[PDB]
Amino acid sequence: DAQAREKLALYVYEYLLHVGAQKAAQTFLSEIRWEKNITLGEPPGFLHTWWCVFWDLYCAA
Amino acid sequence: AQAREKLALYVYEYLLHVGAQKAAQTFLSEIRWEKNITLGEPPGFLHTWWCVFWDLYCAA
Amino acid sequence: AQAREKLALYVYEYLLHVGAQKAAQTFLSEIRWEKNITLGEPPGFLHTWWCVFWDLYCAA
Amino acid sequence: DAQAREKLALYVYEYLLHVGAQKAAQTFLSEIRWEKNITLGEPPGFLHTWWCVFWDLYCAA
């Protein structure tokens, strides 16, 4: 449950960096007082990829 | 491409409901967003989707 | 409850597109289905959903 | 890929038994010439459960 909330934050942060919103990403980590490791993938990152999978499925119904 | 625009909205919603209102404002301005904005109740839809999705993916 | 009725339709579609046309007919008749029926291209929507879902669930 | 197709068939079969369509379930296994093991859960079975999860998500957008 908490592991989920922490992983959403991480992947939102990554998105903000790849979407060209770097200022926003930095302030986001300040506002949630993020004291944990940060491990980054390739653009457009995990959240875009999995969102688009579910979108393609949403638009087929 | 209309997928990317809905994700942006739901992320902006996430940021307000998680108490990252500053980032939220900065976000819209950095992507130069100009469309209309509507939201619902916290925690917001991105959180709702994530909970079932991440429970499916398990992992770390 | 309207969830259960869409699943039935998509299953009836699966059965026709997978070559289980006999089962398909028997199915409708056993649940006493009386609503209108529309389908699309094979393999059908239940297969489409399943492929992304089962790839998420992995398992066995 | 094939593992997926085989697991859909299995879980469709289970559904047909729990939904009160037992004749249909039997003929289904004939028509696909199913020569593999059959392992059954509790009603309403795996496919209903996971369908309803995605439905609840579909009806929240």
Numbering used by the authors:
A (entry chain B), D (entry chain B): 13 to 73
B (entry chain A), C (entry chain A): 14 to 73
Quoted from the paper:
The Chip/LIM-domain binding protein (LDB)–single-stranded DNA-binding protein (SSDP) (ChiLS) complex controls numerous cell-fate decisions in animal cells, by mediating transcription of developmental control genes via remote enhancers. Chip/LDB and SSDP both contain N-terminal dimerization domains that constitute the bulk of their structured cores. We recently discovered that Chip/LDB and SSDP form a stable complex called ChiLS (Chip/LDB-SSDP), which binds to NPFxD motifs within the nuclear Wnt signaling factor Pygopus (Pygo) and Osa/ARID1A, a chromatin-binding subunit of the BAF transcriptional coactivator complex. Here, we report the crystal structures of the DD of SSDP and XLdb1, in the latter case with the help of DARPin (designed ankyrin repeat proteins) chaperones that mask a hydrophobic surface patch of the DD required for its SSDP binding.
SSDP contains an N-terminal LisH domain known to form obligate dimers in other proteins, followed by a highly conserved extension and a long nonconserved C-terminal tail likely to be disordered. To determine the structure of SSDP-N, we optimized its boundaries and succeeded in obtaining crystals for SSDP1–86 that diffracted to 2.4 Å. As we were unable to use molecular replacement with the LisH domain as a search model, we generated 5 different selenomethionine (SeMet)-labeled mutants, 1 of which yielded diffracting crystals that enabled us to determine the structure of SSDP-N. The asymmetric crystallographic unit contains a classic LisH dimer-fold in which 2 α-helices (α1, α2) associate to form an antiparallel 4-helix bundle, the hydrophobic interface of which is strengthened by additional hydrogen bonds in its periphery. A third helix (α3) interacts with its counterpart (α3′) from the opposite dimer to form an X-shaped structure, tucked under the 4-helix bundle. As in other LisH dimers, the dimer interface is extensive (burying ∼2,500 Å2), which explains why SSDP forms obligate dimers, and why SSDP monomers are not detectable (see also below). Within the crystal lattice, symmetry-related dimers associate via 2 perpendicular pairs of antiparallel α3 helices. The resulting interlocked bundle of 4 α-helices bury ∼1,400 Å2, and is held together entirely via hydrophobic contacts, with valine 65 (V65) occupying a central position in the tetramer interface (“α3 interface,” below). Intriguingly, some of the hydrophobic residues in the loop between α2 and α3 also mediate association between symmetry-related dimers in the crystal, resulting in alternative tetramer configurations. We conclude that SSDP binds to Chip/LDB via its α3 surface.
